[PDB]
Design a protein around this ligand. Structure first.
Ligand SMILES: Cc1ccccc1[C@H]1CCCN1C(=O)c1ccc(O)cc1O
Length: 217
């Protein structure tokens, strides 16, 4: 009878990760724009990985040979999406690497901030993904790894995230980070803003970065 039915799992964030997310989403910072640099850096790393694999196994690219990053503002949905065709994440990858396992860099980073370091350094501690919450009230991550199903990860912070199978629109391979922006952060939906931040901070990314301005007609 139902059109669709999907099992949804809810996981608690590891304690230090939950602390970091609260610090990030609540604290005032003057340089929030660095979130885009961090997410693009993540995409680049994921692209480096699938590329490495394809060096010895070309069939790794059967799911798509183009290695690139797309930025997609949607003013109607108030979302900014960063899409890449990197190696993507398995379900275990999602759960392990985006929430439940703390890396040493998590506590280290919060220690660094209290010691006077800047939020812009977050990427050096290996947790730059969470800078997304500088500007987003909710983040949705859609991801597809070779040989695996497509999954959707989601969290509005507050201590937990969900995982479920995603059947919406099939990706060949890679990861899509959908930022549901805070009301006062909608500037990052504007073309001039996206362009100047990419020019300023992502100068040396070795993959094509393309803007797609989305409007439902
Ligand atoms: C960098 C990183 C940190 C933690 C977990 C996974 C990753 C990368 C490398 C392996 C797969 N992966 C992604 O799918 C991915 C994730 C977030 C993101 O914003 C863009 C992405 O492409």
């Amino acid at each position: 009878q139902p059109m669709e039915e999907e099992e949804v799992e809810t996981f608690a964030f590891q304690a230090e990760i939950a602390q970091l997310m609260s610090l990030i989403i609540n604290t005032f910072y003057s340089n929030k724009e660095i979130f885009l640099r961090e997410l693009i850096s993540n995409s680049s790393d994921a692209l480096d990985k699938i590329r490495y694999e394809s060096l010895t196994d070309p069939s790794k690219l059967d799911s798509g040979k183009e290695l690139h990053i797309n930025l997609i503002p949607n003013k109607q949905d108030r979302t900014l999406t960063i899409v890449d065709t990197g190696i993507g994440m398995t379900k275990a990858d999602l759960i392990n690497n985006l929430g439940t396992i703390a890396k040493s860099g998590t506590k280290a980073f919060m220690e660094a901030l209290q010691a006077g370091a800047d939020i812009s350094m977050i990427g050096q501690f290996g947790v730059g993904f969470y800078s997304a919450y500088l500007v987003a009230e909710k983040v949705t991550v859609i991801t597809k790894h070779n040989d695996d199903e497509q999954y959707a990860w989601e969290s509005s912070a507050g201590g937990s995230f969900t995982v479920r199978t995603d059947t919406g629109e099939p990706m060949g391979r890679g990861t899509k980070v959908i930022l549901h922006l805070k009301e006062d952060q909608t500037e990052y939906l504007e073309e001039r803003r996206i362009k100047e931040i990419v020019k300023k901070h992502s100068q040396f990314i070795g993959y094509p970065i393309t803007l797609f301005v989305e409007k439902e007609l």
